[PDB]
Amino acid sequence: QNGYTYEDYQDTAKWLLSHTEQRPQVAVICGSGLGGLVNKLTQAQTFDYSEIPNFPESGRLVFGILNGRACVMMQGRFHMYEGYPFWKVTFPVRVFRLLGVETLVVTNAAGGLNPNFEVGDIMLIRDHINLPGFSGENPLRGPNEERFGVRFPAMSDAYDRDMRQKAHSTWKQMGEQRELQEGTYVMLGGPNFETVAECRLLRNLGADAVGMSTVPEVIVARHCGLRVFGFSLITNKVIMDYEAAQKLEQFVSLLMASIPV
Amino acid sequence: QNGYTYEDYQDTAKWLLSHTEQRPQVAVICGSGLGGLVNKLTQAQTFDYSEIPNFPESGRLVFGILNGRACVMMQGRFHMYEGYPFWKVTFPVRVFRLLGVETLVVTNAAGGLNPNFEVGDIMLIRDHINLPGFSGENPLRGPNEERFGVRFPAMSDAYDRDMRQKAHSTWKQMGEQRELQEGTYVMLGGPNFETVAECRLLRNLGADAVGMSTVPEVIVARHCGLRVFGFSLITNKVIMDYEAAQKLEQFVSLLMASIPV
Amino acid sequence: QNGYTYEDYQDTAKWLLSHTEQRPQVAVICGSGLGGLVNKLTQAQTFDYSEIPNFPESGRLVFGILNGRACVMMQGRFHMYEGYPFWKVTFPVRVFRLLGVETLVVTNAAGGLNPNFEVGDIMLIRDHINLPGFSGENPLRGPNEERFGVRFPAMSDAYDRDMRQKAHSTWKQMGEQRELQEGTYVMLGGPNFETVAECRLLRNLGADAVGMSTVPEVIVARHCGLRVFGFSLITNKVIMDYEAAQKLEQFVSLLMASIPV
Numbered sequence: 208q209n210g211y212t213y214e215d216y217q218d219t220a221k222w223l224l225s226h227t228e229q230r231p232q233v234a235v236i237c238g239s240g241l242g243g244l245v246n247k248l249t250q251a252q253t254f255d256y257s258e259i260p261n262f263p264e265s266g267r268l269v270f271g272i273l274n275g276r277a278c279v280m281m282q283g284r285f286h287m288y289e290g291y292p293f294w295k296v297t298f299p300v301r302v303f304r305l306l307g308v309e310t311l312v313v314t315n316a317a318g319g320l321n322p323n324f325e326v327g328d329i330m331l332i333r334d335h336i337n338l339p340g341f342s343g344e345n346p347l348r349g350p351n352e353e354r355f356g357v358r359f360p361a362m363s364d365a366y367d368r369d370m371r372q373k374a375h376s377t378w379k380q381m382g383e384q385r386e387l388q389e390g391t392y393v394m395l396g397g398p399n400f401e402t403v404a405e406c407r408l409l410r411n412l413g414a415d416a417v418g419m420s421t422v423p424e425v426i427v428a429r430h431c432g433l434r435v436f437g438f439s440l441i442t443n444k445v446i447m448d449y450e451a452a453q454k455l456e457q458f459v460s461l462l463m464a465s466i467p468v
Numbered sequence: 469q470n471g472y473t474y475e476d477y478q479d480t481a482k483w484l485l486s487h488t489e490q491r492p493q494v495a496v497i498c499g500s501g502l503g504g505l506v507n508k509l510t511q512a513q514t515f516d517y518s519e520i521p522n523f524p525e526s527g528r529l530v531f532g533i534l535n536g537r538a539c540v541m542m543q544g545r546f547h548m549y550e551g552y553p554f555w556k557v558t559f560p561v562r563v564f565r566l567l568g569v570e571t572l573v574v575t576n577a578a579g580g581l582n583p584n585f586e587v588g589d590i591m592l593i594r595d596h597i598n599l600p601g602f603s604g605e606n607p608l609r610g611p612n613e614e615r616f617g618v619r620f621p622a623m624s625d626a627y628d629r630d631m632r633q634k635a636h637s638t639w640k641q642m643g644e645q646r647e648l649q650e651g652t653y654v655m656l657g658g659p660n661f662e663t664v665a666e667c668r669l670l671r672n673l674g675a676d677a678v679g680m681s682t683v684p685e686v687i688v689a690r691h692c693g694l695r696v697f698g699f700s701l702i703t704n705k706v707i708m709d710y711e712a713a714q715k716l717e718q719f720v721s722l723l724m725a726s727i728p729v
Numbered sequence: 730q731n732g733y734t735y736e737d738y739q740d741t742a743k744w745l746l747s748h749t750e751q752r753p754q755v756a757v758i759c760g761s762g763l764g765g766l767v768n769k770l771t772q773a774q775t776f777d778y779s780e781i782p783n784f785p786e787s788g789r790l791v792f793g794i795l796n797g798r799a800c801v802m803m804q805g806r807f808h809m810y811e812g813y814p815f816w817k818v819t820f821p822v823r824v825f826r827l828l829g830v831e832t833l834v835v836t837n838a839a840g841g842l843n844p845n846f847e848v849g850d851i852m853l854i855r856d857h858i859n860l861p862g863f864s865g866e867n868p869l870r871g872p873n874e875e876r877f878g879v880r881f882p883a884m885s886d887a888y889d890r891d892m893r894q895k896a897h898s899t900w901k902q903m904g905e906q907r908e909l910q911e912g913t914y915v916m917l918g919g920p921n922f923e924t925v926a927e928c929r930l931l932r933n934l935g936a937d938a939v940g941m942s943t944v945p946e947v948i949v950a951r952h953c954g955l956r957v958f959g960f961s962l963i964t965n966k967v968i969m970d971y972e973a974a975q976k977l978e979q980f981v982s983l984l985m986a987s988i989p990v
């Protein structure tokens with residue numbers, strides 16, 4: 208049961224509003240290996256998660272201006288595999304909503320299931336498969352809070368098309384030799400890596416990349432009306448048979464200018 | 469852990485037996501949009517769930533005679549997405565068993581995965597896929613109570629063939645232009661609606677319709693020996709690619725006469 | 730949340746080390762119908778689970794020498810369907826590690842999904858599919874204990890190849906008419922048996938046999954560095970459409986001699 212009341216989000220949000228003059232419209236959640244993205248922020252202000260009332264423990268929240276856009280960034284995220292229920296993993300997203308954030312950018316490291324993928328590739332997330340969600344492990348599980356969103360939110364249009372279009376055209380302006388990949392991200396609980404049988408299984412379900420986060424954050428963001436778009440850094444080609452983080456940082460930085468104000 | 473002792477079911481059952489002279493042999497569980505089915509009951513008696521000891525909160529239980537058959541009807545059901553564990557969602561089924569009920573009729577609103585389905589269609593449930601059940605979210609999870617059923621109940625014959633046969637022949641007597649659909653119902657936790665990738669995934673698993681209930685009720689009913697049959701009201705054709713409630717009420721009403729006594 | 734501290738495993742392990750002179754290098758986990766495997770032990774010593782501090786309740790642990798190899802055997806195992814979280818189901822594996830065990834042999838009764846399987850067949854487990862694991866129901870869920878293993882353990886090489894090779898050559902020396910089967914074991918929560926739609930679904934995921942255990946034990950064993958190999962006794966051919974325990978005991982006994990010392 209969600210151990211957070213509506214007021215808890217509000218308290219946390221007002222705490223942040225009074226401790227920084229920063230008023231972000233964009234929020235970015237970074238997983239593992241994308242910490243250099245926070246060093247590009249100007250007029251930056253960092254808050255350790257441990258100093259923010261109600262924030263899940265263990266990692267920091269960095270406010271600042273990235274390529275002209277005011278944003279708030281999660282340096283380190285939460286995972287189901289660490290033991291947190293999704294209502295803790297996604298706590299920050301609802302706080303962002305209360306801060307006035309309108310767009311959420313999600314990033315993650317993932318295993319490439321699509322044969323055509325190569326290490327270091329950047330896959331624009333066009334869709335996702337939420338396996339934990341099939342069994343009820345859903346961040347929206349429990350009473351619905353109308354002040355956030357509706358009881359039965361649609362997820363088919365989760366990854367904003369306009370931003371995905373900007374992403375492609377922006378990538379083209381970067382003059383990259385490798386095309387910007389695009390595909391379906393499947394989330395699994397973890398923490399162990401998949402077996403061959405499971406890897407094949409996932410590929411046949413239509414997934415292009417596999418990871419252990421993001422989906423719950425996206426679901427909660429869509430529920431509370433945030434515009435969403437994200438990317439997966441293919442850190443390794445998953446083996447289907449028996450026997451670049453810097454570029455992503457630059458890319459997300461450039462996209463700020465393409466996000467509608 | 470099932471927060472109900474065997475005695476809790478018994479207490480609830482005797483409470484109901486002493487508050488109504490009605491002695492139902494058939495139980496009907498209605499989801500959303502099938503409330504007019506309760507208005508067809510004669511010599512009806514309603515109990516709000518809140519006045520019945522032990523009943524899960526938030527909705528009423530209506531006793532009465534439907535087309536000559538004495539039955540008990542759930543107007544409003546419980547869902548995993550609301551936060552209830554399956555032992556609460558399925559609490560009523562075991563109570564029905566203790567009331568002397570022999571047949572359970574389940575109904576639900578569902579999304580059509582089968583391309584040949586049309587809005588308003590009525591799909592006789594021939595089989596189901598219990599996704600939450602694959603991860604252990606099972607209403608039978610925990611110590612087995614032999615006074616109800618066996619430890620490892622078979623589910624392959626869950627939807628009574630004889631009733632499915634009656635359903636088809638009865639539908640034919642109704643002179644309906646649209647054929648009575650038949651297929652596999654897949655249950656997901658919810659509450660968000662599926663993405664395109666998930667919708668395709670489900671269709672490839674062999675599911676004809678998708679919903680957020682019923683399966684746990686059917687499993688518990690089969691476990692305690694109840695005869696089962698049900699229907700899905702296809703309220704919308706699910707989109708598989710990127711870019712009638714009154715009739716059901718009449719149908720279930722007519723089928724009472726086909727249920728063996 | 731894992732209700733066991735590192736010290737709990739240690740306490741249990743030292744308790745056993747001081748109550749028997751036996752110092753096993755191999756551990757065997759037996760499910761249902763493989764109890765005669767314990768009667769082949771010499772210089773045997775039995776401990777009821779109920780007399781071992783910290784051991785999950787309801788079944789015994791038998792130490793002894795099997796075909797020249799000192800081993801510890803679980804006669805009766807734990808299942809998710811009984812209500813235990815995986816940290817209780819897999820408690821013994823970590824204890825074995827602390828006892829100095831290096832190899833874990835897992836056995837189970839399973840339903841045959843592969844059409845070519847026959848009742849009584851013995852399927853060497855080459856790989857597995859962990860459905861509960863896709864939703865987070867993972868024995869490794871929670872903080873990682875480095876004294877056991879790494880945060881993100883690989884599972885693709887879970888079933889030791891060398892032992893699988895020994896298994897085949899050993900089976901050939903047995904002069905059995907039926908070949909030693911080999912395949913992928915898929916674990917589901919249970920306790921109900923699958924429907925036709927689910928059975929087909931599982932087969933299409935690439936599973937050869939279906940059961941309700943083993944996978945969590947294997948995962949924890951691999952996490953703490955144990956060599957693993959196992960077998961599934963096909964007790965029945967699963968019906969895919971709508972309408973030997975003694976040999977296994979002998980086989981596992983013979984394989985002791987093939988396990989590296």
Ligand SMILES: Nc1nc2c(ncn2CCCCC(F)(F)P(=O)(O)O)c(=O)[nH]1
Nearest residue numbers: 238239315316317318417418419420445
């Ligand atoms: N399931 C799975 N996950 C893989 C794989 N490779 C990398 N990750 C990513 C590891 C987790 C990444 C993260 F969760 F930490 P994140 O926060 O960066 O998303 C893989 O093969 N399978």
Ligand SMILES: Nc1nc2c(ncn2CCCCC(F)(F)P(=O)(O)O)c(=O)[nH]1
Nearest residue numbers: 499500576577578579678679680681706
């Ligand atoms: N998963 C899923 N469910 C869908 C869909 N359309 C209607 N429902 C039914 C909504 C829930 C119905 C109910 F649970 F409330 P019930 O009680 O009527 O079954 C769909 O596309 N996907």
Ligand SMILES: Nc1nc2c(ncn2CCCCC(F)(F)P(=O)(O)O)c(=O)[nH]1
Nearest residue numbers: 760761837838839840939940941942967
């Ligand atoms: N899911 C599933 N399991 C089946 C089937 N047949 C036997 N078991 C094995 C029954 C459980 C075995 C056990 F868990 F008790 P174990 O300890 O022997 O592994 C089947 O068709 N489906």
Ligand SMILES: [Mg+2]
Nearest residue numbers: 257259261262
């Ligand atoms: Mg704190």
Ligand SMILES: [Mg+2]
Nearest residue numbers: 518520522523
């Ligand atoms: Mg009450």
Ligand SMILES: [Mg+2]
Nearest residue numbers: 779781783784
């Ligand atoms: Mg004890």
Ligand SMILES: [Zn+2]
Nearest residue numbers: 222225226227
């Ligand atoms: Zn202050």
Ligand SMILES: [Zn+2]
Nearest residue numbers: 483486487488
């Ligand atoms: Zn009274």
Ligand SMILES: [Zn+2]
Nearest residue numbers: 744747748749
């Ligand atoms: Zn003693």
